[PDB]
Write a protein that binds this ligand. Structure first.
Ligand SMILES: Cc1cc2nc3c(=O)[nH]c(=O)nc-3n(C[C@H](O)[C@H](O)[C@H](O)COP(=O)(O)OP(=O)(O)OC[C@H]3O[C@@H](n4cnc5c(N)ncnc54)[C@H](O)[C@@H]3O)c2cc1C
Ligand SMILES: Cc1cc2nc3c(=O)[nH]c(=O)nc-3n(C[C@H](O)[C@H](O)[C@H](O)COP(=O)(O)OP(=O)(O)OC[C@H]3O[C@@H](n4cnc5c(N)ncnc54)[C@H](O)[C@@H]3O)c2cc1C
Lengths: 399, 399
C-alpha cells in the first residue's frame, strides 16, 4: 500500500474498496475516476424498482464510510503508464499513483446481427440505459428481450407487471445457463410462461428489417423495442494496453494483484479463482463486487489479513420469485426440499458432490439460504436423509 | 532484474532462459534447482531416436552459453516465501533470491481407471520413463497406447519400426484433437493404420484386470504394457501455495510476470496469451519453451526489449511423416497445396480467416514452412488463387 491511491471506475466494487481502506485505517490520498457523470449508484434496481418507479435517488450508494475521497465523475481514464506510475485522463489531467486499482467493471456485449438495425435496440447496464428503456415502455407495447440470463428475466417480469407484451429469445435450450441448476432453470421458464412471456428456445437472431427481428429458424418477431442481454465483456482495455495478463478479464490472485507491480483489480473486470471448482472465472455477481473489493482493501492495509475467500453466490428478483443461488449448479446428486409448484412457489435445492454440499438454491425461502451458505463454506457432509427430511431445521444443523 | 537469480526447473525453458541472461550481459549469481538427477537434456528424442538407440549423451542440452551457473541436480524446491525472498530445498538448504523464475514444466496426467492396475503402466516424460519403456519393448510384444496426441503417435511409429504390435485408444473422434487441422488428423490416422497400428476411436479406458484393458464399449484389449499419454498438468504447486494466480498453469503476461512481485514463470508451466486467438492457453510446444525463455530473459536484462511475441508452432516426427504445424487449426477456409496421398506423402495446408493467413501445416515439406510462418507472423492476405497455384513459390511471395 503505497500512497496515493487511484481507483479507476466508480461502481459498487470501487465504492466498497475505498470505504474499506478508510475504515481499515488508510488516511492517505484516494482519488476515484468514474466515466459516468452520476453520483455512484447500484445497478440491480435498474431492472426492477427503478424501471418501474423511476427515482434514482433511491439507488445511490452510500459513500459516507469513504470520507476525504475525491470522485472525478464524468471523466475517462484513457491509459496508464505503469513505469511512470501515472494515469492519463480524458480532461487532459494526469494523476500520479503509488497504488493503482482497476475497478472498471464490464459492458454489455453487442449483437453483431443488430449492428445496423433501424429500430430501437438497447442494452441494460446504466442509469442512462434504464431511462431510455423506460421511455419506450408503454402499456401494450411489444418488447423483445434477447438473452435468458437474470437481467433479461428480471426486466421481463417488470415489463409484464407494467402491461408490456414480452417475447424472449434464448439461444441455449434453458434459461440461466450460467450458474443455475437445471431444475431451477426449468421452473423459472414455467413461471415466466405462466405470466405471459413468449419464450423461444434454441433460436438465434440473424438480423432485422423495418421493425421486425429475424431468427435462425427462418421466422420473424415484430417488436417496438429490442433489449439485448446476452452477457457482458470485461472493461479491460487499459490493462491490455499496459501489458497486464487479461483474457476478457484481468487475471488476479486472492490479494487482487495483477501481473503488473503496484496495479490491482477487483469486481466485474477480474478473472479470479473459484474455490469450489478450482478454476478461474469472471464472477459477475453483486456479492463478489462488494466482498472482493473489501477483501483486497483489507489486505492492502493489513497484509496479515487473509486473501479474498468467499464462495460465489447471487440473487435475482423475478416477479413473485425471490431467487437465491450459491456454489456450483450441479454435483453428483440434487436434494429437493419442498414442492416445485407454481402455486405459491417455495423450495430449496441442494447440490452434493461425494456427500459434500457444493451448491444450494432457495426460491422464496431466504431463511434457509444463510445456513446453507455456511454449510457450503466449510464443505459440510450432512446426512442426506436429514437434508431431504422437511422436519430438519437447516439453521440447527448448521451448528 | 534483482540479483541473485534462482530458477526452479532445469528443462529446456530453464536452460534457454539462463543462457540468454548470460548472453544479454547479466553476470550476477544464477542458481538452478532441478529435481531430476540428470544432466539437463531434451525430451523429443525420448519418443524417437533415444527410444530406438538408447544413447542419452546424444540428447543433452548445451549449457556452454550459460557459464558460471550452479545447477543443483536431484534436488526439489519444496516451497518459496515471496515475502522473505527465499526458496526451501529438499536437501535442507535455503536459497535467497532477488528474482525467482518458475520453469517447472508439466507432468503426465494419470489415468484414474488404471490407478490400481497390476500390469505395467507407464507415462512418457522423462529419461527414466523412456528407459523403463524400452526395457519392456521386445519385438512382437503388444503395446497399448492410451491417447492420440503427438507423443503417443511418435511412440507408436517407433514401436512399430521395432517390430512391436501397437494398439491405440483415443477418446476423441480424431487424433491430435489439440492444435491440428482435421485434414491433417484424418491423414495421420490413415498413415498409422497403414503401418499396422490398431486404432480405436471414441473409446475410453474403464479399468483393467490381470493384463487386459477394459473399454467403455464393453470390450477388452490384452497388452504386455500400457503407455498413457492423455496430456499433461502444469507443475504449479509451489505457485499455488505461495498465492500466485494459477489454473493448471501459472498466469503470466508477455514479460513472464506472475501476479507475485519478483516472481516470473516460463515454458510448459505457464498459461499465456495466444496472439492469434487472443485467448490464454497453456502452450506446450518445444519452440515456446525455448523462445519464451529467451524473451523473458532478454526483457529482464534490457527492459526496452519487447515482450514475448511469437505465434505458436510445433513439429512431430512420426515415421515417414515429418509434420510441422503453425497457428490455428482452422479458419473460414483451408487451402491445400499438393496431393494428400500415402504414396510418398508431401503436402501443405493453409488456414485462412477473412483472407488473412492464421495457420499452416507442412508434411514432408520443410521448405515451405518457414515462409508460411513469416507470412503468418505479419497477418498476410495473399491471393488465394496464387496460394493454391502450385506454380507459386511461397518463399518468393513471402517478400
Ligand atoms: C440491470 C442490472 C441488474 C442487476 N441485477 C443483479 C442481480 O439480480 N443480482 C446480482 O448478483 N447482480 C445484479 N446486478 C448487479 C451487479 O452484479 C453489479 O452491478 C456489478 O457486479 C458491479 O461490479 P463493478 O463495480 O465491478 O462494475 P461496474 O458496476 O460496471 O462499475 C464500473 C464502472 O467503471 C466505469 N469505467 C469503465 N472504464 C472506465 C474508465 N476507462 N475510466 C473511468 N471509468 C470507467 C464503468 O463505466 C462503470 O461505471 C445487476 C446489474 C445490472 C446492470
Ligand atoms: C516424449 C516427448 C516427446 C516430445 N516431442 C515433441 C515434439 O515432437 N514437438 C514438440 O514441440 N515438443 C515435443 N516435446 C518436447 C517439449 O515440448 C519440451 O520438452 C517442453 O515443452 C519443455 O518445457 P519445460 O522446460 O518448460 O518443462 P520441462 O521439460 O518439464 O522441465 C521442467 C523441469 O522442472 C522439474 N521440476 C518440477 N518441479 C520441480 C521442483 N519443485 N523443483 C525442482 N525441479 C522441478 C521437472 O521435473 C522438469 O524436470 C516432447 C516431450 C516429450 C516428453
Amino acid at each position: 500500500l503505497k500512497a496515493p491511491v487511484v481507483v479507476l471506475g466508480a461502481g459498487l466494487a470501487s465504492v466498497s474498496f475505498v470505504a474499506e481502506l478508510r475504515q481499515a485505517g488508510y488516511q492517505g490520498l484516494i482519488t476515484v475516476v468514474g466515466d459516468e457523470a452520476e453520483r455512484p449508484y447500484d445497478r440491480p434496481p435498474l431492472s426492477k424498482d427503478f424501471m418501474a418507479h423511476g427515482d434514482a435517488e433511491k439507488i445511490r450508494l452510500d459513500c459516507k464510510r469513504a470520507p476525504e475521497v475525491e470522485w472525478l465523475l464524468g471523466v475517462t481514464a484513457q491509459s496508464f503508464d505503469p513505469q511512470a506510475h501515472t494515469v492519463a485522463l480524458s480532461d487532459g489531467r494526469t494523476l500520479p499513483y503509488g497504488t493503482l486499482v482497476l475497478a472498471t467493471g464490464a459492458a454489455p456485449r453487442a449483437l453483431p446481427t443488430l449492428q445496423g438495425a433501424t429500430m430501437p435496440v438497447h442494452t441494460l447496464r446504466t442509469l442512462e440505459d434504464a431511462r431510455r428503456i423506460q421511455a419506450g415502455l408503454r402499456p401494450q407495447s411489444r418488447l423483445l428481450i434477447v438473452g435468458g440470463g437474470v437481467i433479461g428475466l428480471e426486466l421481463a417480469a417488470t415489463a409484464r407487471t407494467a402491461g408490456v407484451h414480452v417475447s424472449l429469445v434464448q439461444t441455449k435450450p434453458r434459461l440461466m445457463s450460467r450458474a443455475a441448476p437445471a431444475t431451477l432453470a426449468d421452473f423459472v421458464a414455467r413461471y415466466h410462461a405462466a405470466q405471459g412471456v413468449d419464450l423461444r428456445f434454441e433460436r438465434s437472431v440473424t438480423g432485422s428489417v423495418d421493425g421486425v427481428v429475424l431468427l435462425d429458424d427462418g421466422t420473424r418477431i415484430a417488436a417496438d423495442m429490442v433489449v439485448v442481454g446476452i452477457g457482458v465483456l470485461a472493461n479491460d482495455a487499459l490493462a491490455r494496453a499496459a501489458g497486464l495478463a487479461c483474457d476478457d478479464g484481468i487475471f488476479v490472485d486472492a490479494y487482487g494483484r495483477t501481473t503488473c507491480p503496484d496495479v490491482y483489480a477487483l469486481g466485474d473486470v477480474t478473472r479470479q479463482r473459484n474455490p469450489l471448482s478450482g478454476r478461474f472465472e469472471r464472477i459477475e455477481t453483486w456479492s463478489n463486487a462488494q466482498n472482493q473489493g473489501i477483501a483486497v482493501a483489507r489486505h492492502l492495509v493489513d497484509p496479515t489479513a487473509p486473501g479474498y475467500a468467499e464462495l460465489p453466490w447471487y440473487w435475482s428478483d423475478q416477479g413473485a420469485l425471490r431467487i437465491q443461488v450459491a456454489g456450483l449448479a450441479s454435483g453428483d446428486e440434487e436434494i429437493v426440499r419442498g414442492e416445485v409448484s407454481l402455486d405459491a412457489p417455495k423450495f430449496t435445492l441442494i447440490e452434493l458432490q461425494k456427500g459434500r454440499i457444493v451448491g444450494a438454491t432457495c426460491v422464496n425461502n431466504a431463511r434457509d439460504f444463510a445456513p446453507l451458505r455456511r454449510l457450503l463454506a466449510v464443505g459440510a457432509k450432512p446426512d442426506r436423509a436429514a437434508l431431504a427430511d422437511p422436519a430438519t431445521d437447516l439453521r440447527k444443523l448448521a451448528a
